[PDB]
User: What shape does this take?
Amino acid sequence: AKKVQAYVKLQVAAGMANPSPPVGPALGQQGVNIMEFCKAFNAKTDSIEKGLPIPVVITVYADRSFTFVTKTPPAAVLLKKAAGIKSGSGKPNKDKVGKISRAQLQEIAQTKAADMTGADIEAMTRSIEGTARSMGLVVED
Amino acid sequence: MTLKELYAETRSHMQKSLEVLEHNLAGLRTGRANPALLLHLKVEYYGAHVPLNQIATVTAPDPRTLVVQSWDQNALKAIEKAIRDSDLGLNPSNKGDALYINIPPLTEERRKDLVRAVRQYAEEGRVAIRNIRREALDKLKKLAKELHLSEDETKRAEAEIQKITDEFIAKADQLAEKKEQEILG
Amino acid sequence: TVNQLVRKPRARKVAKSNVPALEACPQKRGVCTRVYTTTPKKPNSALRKVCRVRLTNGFEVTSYIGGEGHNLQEHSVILIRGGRVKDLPGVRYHTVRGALDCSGVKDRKQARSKYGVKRPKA
RNA sequence: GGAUGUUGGCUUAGAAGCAGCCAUCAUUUAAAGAAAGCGUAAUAGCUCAC
RNA sequence: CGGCCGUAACUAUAACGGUCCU
RNA sequence: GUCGGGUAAGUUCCGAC
RNA sequence: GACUGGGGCGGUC
RNA sequence: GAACGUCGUGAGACAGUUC
RNA sequence: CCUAGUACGAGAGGACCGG
RNA sequence: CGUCACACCAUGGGAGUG
RNA sequence: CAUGACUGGGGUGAAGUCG
Assistant: This one.
């Protein structure tokens, strides 16, 4: 929506960071300061919400300094917790791993509303449904 | 018999002789110089348990030495602590950017003693196949008299038996020669 | 009689030393062709351990590998000593225990000199 | 101009439109394929459909 | 002045056994 | 023919079976 | 003895 | 010319060997 | 042999083109 | 007791070879 | 004096076949 600048995107757990494989080398290649971010990220993430993986967009500058915006957790993850399942279908639509009431879809749609473009609630729900269909999660209306 | 059954029998017999030859040859002393052997080993790489193949390669330039190149230096260490006492009992050496893992050698003197044995097994196959051609010719002689086959018929039958012979001779030569190169490598 | 003696006196007797690895030596080095487990004579039973040796002087010969615990290979270098063995014919030698590329009895606390042992765990 | 859920789910060391398997909806719209090819270790980036 | 068949420690051979006719 | 010999290499040759 | 895709062998008269 | 094996009562013969 | 022990390659090894 | 199998040990003979 | 296709007898062994 603005001028595109160098920046990495990744989904890190709420209250935890700094391991090399998960993070470190990922943004580390960019010139990011892992230590600062790990502490910085976990700082606000505890308040926003712990226990839920939240994707964040790191924006590094020429100063190799950086900023990041914390958005809402992915639709897939919220659907997984709502479904009460650990993973997706593996073979979506063919085999249903779990289900979600339409009410919950509205809840998730509500949560991600900030990130969603949907003009109305019905709209955002329909978008959430899209994710559910891809993960083998049916919705009971 | 008939000509058709003589051919079928002869070809069967020779094939069976070729199979005894295949058996005598097909043993080899390689059986620990395999590269696929070490891919199952979980390697400690950055405290994670990455499979050996994803972190390293195992090549064999000969089946005497085995060299294991490991992309990362830390991983190479943890590969070394597994090659030895596990169930293999091998002896890796740290030599270069790869582990050299020696497999039992064979002196050149024993290599002579081995190549002659191959040729002896080769000769057991060939002698059997030629003796079957000989026997087939003998059977054809009886058959010719018995079924009152003409001379020309018998010569056509001889050519057919001979053609079958030369195929099994050819197959024998190929088997021996290939095994010879394996032994010499 | 003196006369019969003056002509053809009293002949000696070339002492036949039952030992191919002669050379008048206390022992001889070998190479070990293989490791057998041949059976004894008629009076005794139980399979003993032996092994053909390619003595330094070429003279091949099987030596006994006494001790309650063998540990030789088909290429290991041992040292022949002597002293034949009854139950085992043709086997008129024994491999030195605790010498060359051989080993030596384990956990043995009696008759340490013989076999392979030198002052136990104290 | 080619957006958002979304790096779709699975798989995988990684698989983010573009190794592979399944699905291929919904939202914003003037338009915008869970994407046509190149490309990256994977992203990125470039070009295409419209 | 003979055949056919089975057979011992890695095979291969078979001292051995069988069997048909001289 | 097979093995050995001579030869850098020997359908001939020499020694065997 | 002949016939015979020379003759012969084979086969047929 | 001669010989062996073999094919033929045989003269001889062989997509065999031998001097 | 020079190019060039270079390109390529983990090493091992080892060109193109042209002379 | 002597063949005849095997497996080792030493040894005579040998086209000849060094 | 060393060695050689093959070959003869000798010696052990574990004791097999045959008497």
Q: What stands out?
A: The beta strands of chain B are 42-45, 48-51, 56-59, 65-70, 92-94, 98-102.
